[PDB]
Amino acid sequence: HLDDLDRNILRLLKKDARLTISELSEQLKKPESTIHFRIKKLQERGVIERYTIILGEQLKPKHLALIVLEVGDFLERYISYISSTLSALPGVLFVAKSGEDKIIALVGKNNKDELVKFIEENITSIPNLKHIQIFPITEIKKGEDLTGFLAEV
Amino acid sequence: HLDDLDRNILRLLKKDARLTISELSEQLKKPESTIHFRIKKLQERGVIERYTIILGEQLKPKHLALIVLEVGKPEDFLERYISYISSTLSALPGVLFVAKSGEDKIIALVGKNNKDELVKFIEENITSIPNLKHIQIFPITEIKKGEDLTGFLAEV
Ligand SMILES: [Au+]
Ligand SMILES: [Au+]
């Protein structure tokens, strides 16, 4: 399906999605036609799903915590309720189900006491409620751009 | 300092960064030269940090897991030991995502294609790490907010 030309195109566009057809041709030493037709195929077959931007600077939250929460058939539904409630809240960047059972959230605020207060009013406050682990993120070694990607507004 | 027009431009670009200035000016009802200037300015200040693509399900990992490691004992040695495990993990295929929590934990996001490749991954690269007090594995069953994370982090 994908050969090395497709993969090289995708790698360049992951670093800088502004790169035009003549630019990729000059960087990849392939004719402009060839590249044009490859890109057009990656887009029609959904391999490139979407073009977006990474936010930097004053729009990445300063303090991040990862939270894993465990609730104690009504169960499918209660996790659905908690997770839509968390999804609607500002500074909640990522929400996922895990097993039956569990919710993973990444939350971010600009003040650490604001992040404590937020946990504490919106998460530790959920009824039935067996366990919660909070993992404040002190540094990111790989995937630093994730915050700028998930960050809203 | 950001105003409503700054935010509105960013929202649309976060939506679809293929949107050109003339399309943004039509959608926002602002002269083209204002949009243009605002975009150059956000790019210069690093508010728009980077333009990227999100990969489609052919290149996304089908099975994702979050891993939480807690080190028992490697204080200057703890810091250095975590760096070592961080760098070892980062160099591995499928590793999305590595972060340090507090002085003693490593958080990783791993994608593979089966259950299975993940089990085999944990056998080989996680339970082989010496001096770990705790290992937790949280399979991602369903992403509710942020589903395009794995298309963003997917390596090719
Ligand atoms: Au916290
Ligand atoms: Au395992």
Structure description:
Two copies of one chain form a homodimer. With 153 residues, chain A is an alpha+beta fold. Chain A has two domains: 1-54, Arc Repressor Mutant, subunit A (Orthogonal Bundle), CATH 1.10.10.10; 55-153, Alpha-Beta Plaits (2-Layer Sandwich), CATH 3.30.70.920. The first copy, chain A, contains six helices and six strands; from the N terminus they run αααββαββαββα. Chain A has helices at residues 4-15, 21-28, 32-44, 74-87, 112-122, 146-150; strands at residues 48-55, 63-71, 92-98, 102-109, 129-136, 139-142. Chain A has a four-stranded antiparallel beta sheet. Chain A is elongated and about 60 Å long. β6 of chain A pairs antiparallel with β3 of chain B. Chain A: InterPro entries: ArsR-like_HTH, AsnC-type_HTH_dom, HTH-Siroheme_Decarb, PF0864-like_C, Tscrpt_reg_AsnC-like, WH-like_DNA-bd_sf, WH_DNA-bd_sf. Chain A: Residues 21-40 bind DNA. Chain A: Keywords: DNA-binding, Transcription, Transcription regulation. Chain A: One of its GO terms (molecular function) is sequence-specific DNA binding. Chain A: Pfam families: AsnC_trans_reg_3, HTH_24.
Largest interface, Cβ cutoff 8 Å: A-B, 60 and 59 residues
From the coordinates shown, what is the CATH architecture of the largest domain in chain A? 2-Layer Sandwich
Bound molecules: gold ion
Strand coverage percent of chain A: 25-35%
Count, helices of chain A = 6
Count of beta strands of chain A: 6
Q: Determine the CATH superfamily of the largest domain in chain A.
A: Lrp/AsnC effector binding domain/regulation of amino acid metabolism (RAM) domain
